[PDB]
Design a protein around this nucleic acid. Sequence first.
RNA 1: UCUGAUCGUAUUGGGCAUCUAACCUCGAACCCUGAAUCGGGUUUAGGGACAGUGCCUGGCGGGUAGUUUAACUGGGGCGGUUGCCUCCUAAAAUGUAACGGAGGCGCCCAAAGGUUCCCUCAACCUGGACGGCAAUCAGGUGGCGAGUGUAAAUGCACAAGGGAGCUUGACUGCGAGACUUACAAGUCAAGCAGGGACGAAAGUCGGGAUUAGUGAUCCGGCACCCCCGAGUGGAAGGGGUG
RNA 2: UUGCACUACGAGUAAAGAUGCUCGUUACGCGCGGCAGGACGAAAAGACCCCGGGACCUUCACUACAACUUGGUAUUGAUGU
RNA 3: UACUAAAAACACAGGUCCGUGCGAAGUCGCAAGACGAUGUAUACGGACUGACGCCUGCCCGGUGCUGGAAGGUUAAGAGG
RNA 4: AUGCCGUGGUGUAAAGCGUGGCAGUGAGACGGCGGGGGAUAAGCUCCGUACGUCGAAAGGGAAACAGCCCAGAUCGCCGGC
RNA 5: GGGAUGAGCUGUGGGUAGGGGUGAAAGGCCAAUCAAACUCCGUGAUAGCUGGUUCUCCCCGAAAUGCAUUUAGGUGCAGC
RNA 6: GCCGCAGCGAAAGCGAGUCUGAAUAGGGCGACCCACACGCGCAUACGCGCGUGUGAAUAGUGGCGUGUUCUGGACCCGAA
RNA 7: AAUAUAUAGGGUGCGGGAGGGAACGCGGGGAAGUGAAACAUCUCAGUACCCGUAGGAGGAGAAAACAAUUGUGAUUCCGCA
Lengths: 48, 77, 62, 96
Amino acid sequence: VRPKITLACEVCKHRNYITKKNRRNDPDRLELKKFCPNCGKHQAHRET
Amino acid sequence: GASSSRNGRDSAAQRLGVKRYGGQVVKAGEILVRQRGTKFHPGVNVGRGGDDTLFAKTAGAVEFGIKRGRKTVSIVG
Amino acid sequence: PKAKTHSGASKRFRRTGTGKIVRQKANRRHLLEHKPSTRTRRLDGRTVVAANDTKRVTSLLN
Amino acid sequence: EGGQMPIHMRLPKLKGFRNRFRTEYEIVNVGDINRLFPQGGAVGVDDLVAKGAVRKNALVKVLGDGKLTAKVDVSAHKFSGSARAKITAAGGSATE
RNA sequence: UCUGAUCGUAUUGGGCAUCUAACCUCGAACCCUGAAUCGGGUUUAGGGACAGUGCCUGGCGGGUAGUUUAACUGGGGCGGUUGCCUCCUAAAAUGUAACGGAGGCGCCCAAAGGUUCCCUCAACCUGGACGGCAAUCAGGUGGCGAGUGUAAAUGCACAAGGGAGCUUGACUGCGAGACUUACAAGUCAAGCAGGGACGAAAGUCGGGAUUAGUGAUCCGGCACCCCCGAGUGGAAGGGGUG
RNA sequence: UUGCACUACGAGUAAAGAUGCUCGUUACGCGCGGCAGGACGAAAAGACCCCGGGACCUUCACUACAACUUGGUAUUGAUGU
RNA sequence: UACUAAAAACACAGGUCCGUGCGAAGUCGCAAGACGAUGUAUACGGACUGACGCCUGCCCGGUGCUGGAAGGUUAAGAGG
RNA sequence: AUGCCGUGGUGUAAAGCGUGGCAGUGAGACGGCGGGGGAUAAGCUCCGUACGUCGAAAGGGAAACAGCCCAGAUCGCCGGC
RNA sequence: GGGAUGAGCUGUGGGUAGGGGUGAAAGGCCAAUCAAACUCCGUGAUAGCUGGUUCUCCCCGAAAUGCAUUUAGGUGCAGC
RNA sequence: GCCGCAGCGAAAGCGAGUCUGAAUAGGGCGACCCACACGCGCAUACGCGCGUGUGAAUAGUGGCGUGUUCUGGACCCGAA
RNA sequence: AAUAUAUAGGGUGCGGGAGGGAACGCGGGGAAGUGAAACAUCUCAGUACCCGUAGGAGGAGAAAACAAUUGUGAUUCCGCA
Ligand SMILES: *C(=O)[C@H](CCSC)NC=O
Ligand SMILES: [Mg+2]
Ligand SMILES: [Mg+2]
Ligand SMILES: [Mg+2]
Ligand SMILES: [Mg+2]
Ligand SMILES: [Mg+2]
Ligand SMILES: [Mg+2]
Ligand SMILES: [Mg+2]
Ligand SMILES: [Mg+2]
Ligand SMILES: [Mg+2]
Ligand SMILES: [Mg+2]
Ligand SMILES: [Mg+2]
Ligand SMILES: [Mg+2]
Ligand SMILES: [Mg+2]
Ligand SMILES: [Mg+2]
Ligand SMILES: [Mg+2]
Ligand SMILES: [Mg+2]
Ligand SMILES: [Mg+2]
Ligand SMILES: [Mg+2]
Ligand SMILES: [Mg+2]
Ligand SMILES: [Mg+2]
Ligand SMILES: [Mg+2]
Ligand SMILES: [Mg+2]
Ligand SMILES: [Mg+2]
Ligand SMILES: [Mg+2]
Ligand SMILES: [Mg+2]
Ligand SMILES: [Mg+2]
Ligand SMILES: [Mg+2]
Ligand SMILES: [Mg+2]
Ligand SMILES: [Mg+2]
Ligand SMILES: [Mg+2]
Ligand SMILES: [Mg+2]
Ligand SMILES: [Mg+2]
Ligand SMILES: [Mg+2]
Ligand SMILES: [Mg+2]
Ligand SMILES: [Mg+2]
Ligand SMILES: [Mg+2]
Ligand SMILES: [Mg+2]
Ligand SMILES: [Mg+2]
Ligand SMILES: [Mg+2]
Ligand SMILES: [Mg+2]
Ligand SMILES: [Mg+2]
Ligand SMILES: [Mg+2]
Ligand SMILES: [Mg+2]
Ligand SMILES: [Mg+2]
Ligand SMILES: [Mg+2]
Ligand SMILES: [Mg+2]
Ligand SMILES: [Mg+2]
Ligand SMILES: [Mg+2]
Ligand SMILES: [Mg+2]
Ligand SMILES: [Mg+2]
Ligand SMILES: [Mg+2]
Ligand SMILES: [Mg+2]
Ligand SMILES: [Mg+2]
Ligand SMILES: [Mg+2]
Ligand SMILES: [Mg+2]
Ligand SMILES: [Mg+2]
Ligand SMILES: [Mg+2]
Ligand SMILES: [Mg+2]
Ligand SMILES: [Mg+2]
Ligand SMILES: [Mg+2]
Ligand SMILES: [Mg+2]
Ligand SMILES: [Mg+2]
Ligand SMILES: [Mg+2]
Ligand SMILES: [Mg+2]
Ligand SMILES: [Mg+2]
Ligand SMILES: [Mg+2]
Ligand SMILES: [Mg+2]
Ligand SMILES: [Mg+2]
Ligand SMILES: [Mg+2]
Ligand SMILES: [Mg+2]
Ligand SMILES: [Mg+2]
Ligand SMILES: [Mg+2]
Ligand SMILES: [Mg+2]
Ligand SMILES: [Mg+2]
Ligand SMILES: [Mg+2]
Ligand SMILES: [Mg+2]
Ligand SMILES: [Mg+2]
Ligand SMILES: [Mg+2]
Ligand SMILES: [Zn+2]
């Protein structure tokens, strides 16, 4: 019910972060700005 | 015979309390007071910490005090 | 005969240039989501084998 | 250790692999050349074996630790970057 | 060119029936044979590509074999218990035992995180359409008796409690110096840089008032880096990082 | 069988049931025949009990294996449908 | 139960069920071979009951045994 | 009140610390003082105590009497306190 | 004291062998031995268990606690 | 042939450094003498840097003792 | 011979084998206790034992070999690695 989701960059597609959401309160994929170390800056991040 | 089936357990002792006493010379980064909550508050050159851990920001001497009812820990550089 | 060294300990310990014995650190292979990056950076790299283990570790390497 | 998981199984294995095809060099410093050959001249691999600076039957490699003040002219394998500097700055050359 | 039907060609396979020559017969006769209910050979009567056996493969299998079946404990059995967190025992630092006294945990939250700003509670009293002990309202009084996602202790009214705006630091590269400690572990951390959020600024931010919500190694999986590549160029496989 | 030996009793004491220790009381030295209270008498490294090991037995404990059995394939051919 | 148990234990004649169509089933052997038996279902092997008399009720859900094969699942081989 | 941590003096040979060689121990016992379990019983049982003795401590006292009181035995003496 | 014309007793010769025999069945018996005989070899089996371990003096001198443990009469590390 | 003679890194590699990193950031591991005469811009006299040393204070390795230890019955005796 | 070709078989005449040996060789079969502080993979260990078969030794042996750009040139045994 609280799965471990991974967040991938929207440019280089590297899976930089892993976290947890609720599968029922947030039934679709997260979107967060996170720091991408490959791009060297903040990019957008969906799930996989 | 019956049993103490409801009791018999405890957690580990957490080694809380004052680690450096008054007038004692410390280094930068030394933990002064380890506590739950703020039994002691930070003062000059003292920071709180993530689990209320009251370390040293500056080398100096530990001194305890009062600041409007609350008891504080300070460092005199 | 001839002394055989210990195969499992030679995969875990090695020596520096001065003769210190170094190891790697546990709690790092998996289950890494609930561990903050202050913890994995603490468990990163190598440290010297502690003084209370250095007599038994030296005899496993010899 | 009495039954608990021992020190050679608690700890993770050291990371990595061993290179099967690793070439190894026998090391001589350029400050040792200055002490062994205080007159300069040609310095070969055979001349370093007899002077005890290096082992037999192995590829040599000049490194640049020390102070070279003599005018040597040294043939070896794989000079260091700071060793090519100190040999020419003392007045000599370094070939493969 | 599609679904459905039919047909031809070629290929492969299953049923069904017949055949005899492989093979089978403790059915019969004859010979080796002088003495032979053995054996082998010959002919005949049947059976027959079945059976039996080899290799491969699934089932069943206490018939046999090797073994495992925990500890604690006011003897053992039976019952209960085992890790983590909080309190008392605990003798005013820390630590401290018993099958001593009480409870919780194996989660939850995309806001219940971050920052900026603003607010003060419960209870009591008086008045008020429905309306009551108590809904919403108005005025008094009230320094914390309320509240805190969740047990308890220590905290918090300066708020860490209530409301709102924008946000993703629930960062990456690190870390002087400490706490705790047999060891493995655990915990805290000023500050530095990159790229960010909020704020006029000062600044603050490496999840949550704090302490539980977890599992060493080995062995693998996936993603990226492009380090090694068993003559060479690749590949297989391995290695690093998450 | 046997560590010894010129090997009493009572109240105590002590590893908590004393010939041997304390304080007393009693007892000439040495044999023979009887009795069976003690010497925690002798014999058997307690069968009970528990802990460690083993063995054999049981079964819907675990892993195997014989036996029995399934299909493919070889031995294995011919012809119709 | 030689050597602490002679019994109410075992055996028995009679009973019933089950297996077996014949180098039978069953057993001993890796096999050949043997026994069963120079026997042939009124026979032979297993199991349970135990002279005799009167009797032996109900349950086929569990678990085995026997028979079946519509459906589900499933090996190697084939297919590629 | 004690205890604990720091610091300045003063005292005190066989203290402390770091790193090597070789250990043994990990069944404790009673007494004082503080507490739990038990009936505020136990020669009970479980903890605390820079508390003590026995363990591993002879000698003197407690009649005898591991643990209580005094005192720590290098050896000799027909000395003394 | 039981049987004592019988499912009797006995003599001689023979057959069955160790996870095997044989058993009117007691785990009986298989050379005074049987819940798997005896003998030799593997072999000097192994035992966290009990016992034993041999001349002298000098100097120092413990511990019976903590933590972990298929661990609690064992051991590792710390303490001394 | 072995050990000493340079280390760091998973490794490619580079080397008194090197790994990580964007870093000329910090950290790890590894080298690194001021006890000292003159002097060099010198600093209150102090000592940072380098020649000649004032001639700084180190090193391994092969034998043989001894203690522990590894593999062997491994101090000796003892099962079912 | 049955039975025709013949064959099985039988007659005759020369040769050879058989068994024993202490260890060593080659080929085949193959444990357990033990160790893993339990135990099944694993170990013990291809050991013990067994079967066949030699010889004064035996086995191996004359590249369908290594190696890695240079090369070595049948096998066996020893020391290193
Ligand atoms: C109990 O079973 C009994 C006790 C023995 S009394 C010393 N043992 C019988 O063998
Ligand atoms: Mg939402
Ligand atoms: Mg607590
Ligand atoms: Mg936190
Ligand atoms: Mg990993
Ligand atoms: Mg992480
Ligand atoms: Mg364990
Ligand atoms: Mg069955
Ligand atoms: Mg069994
Ligand atoms: Mg075994
Ligand atoms: Mg027990
Ligand atoms: Mg009990
Ligand atoms: Mg106290
Ligand atoms: Mg306390
Ligand atoms: Mg509970
Ligand atoms: Mg918010
Ligand atoms: Mg919480
Ligand atoms: Mg708030
Ligand atoms: Mg997170
Ligand atoms: Mg650090
Ligand atoms: Mg910034
Ligand atoms: Mg701005
Ligand atoms: Mg910060
Ligand atoms: Mg493992
Ligand atoms: Mg290649
Ligand atoms: Mg790959
Ligand atoms: Mg990293
Ligand atoms: Mg008496
Ligand atoms: Mg007396
Ligand atoms: Mg006397
Ligand atoms: Mg008398
Ligand atoms: Mg008499
Ligand atoms: Mg008696
Ligand atoms: Mg007796
Ligand atoms: Mg005994
Ligand atoms: Mg078949
Ligand atoms: Mg077949
Ligand atoms: Mg009898
Ligand atoms: Mg009798
Ligand atoms: Mg049959
Ligand atoms: Mg019938
Ligand atoms: Mg029946
Ligand atoms: Mg009956
Ligand atoms: Mg009958
Ligand atoms: Mg039915
Ligand atoms: Mg059926
Ligand atoms: Mg020491
Ligand atoms: Mg103890
Ligand atoms: Mg003991
Ligand atoms: Mg105690
Ligand atoms: Mg008391
Ligand atoms: Mg006691
Ligand atoms: Mg006491
Ligand atoms: Mg005394
Ligand atoms: Mg003493
Ligand atoms: Mg005395
Ligand atoms: Mg006296
Ligand atoms: Mg006097
Ligand atoms: Mg009579
Ligand atoms: Mg008579
Ligand atoms: Mg009669
Ligand atoms: Mg038998
Ligand atoms: Mg019985
Ligand atoms: Mg007998
Ligand atoms: Mg047996
Ligand atoms: Mg053996
Ligand atoms: Mg032994
Ligand atoms: Mg002494
Ligand atoms: Mg113990
Ligand atoms: Mg120890
Ligand atoms: Mg290296
Ligand atoms: Mg560095
Ligand atoms: Mg020397
Ligand atoms: Mg003819
Ligand atoms: Mg012969
Ligand atoms: Mg075995
Ligand atoms: Mg074992
Ligand atoms: Mg053992
Ligand atoms: Mg030959
Ligand atoms: Zn990116």
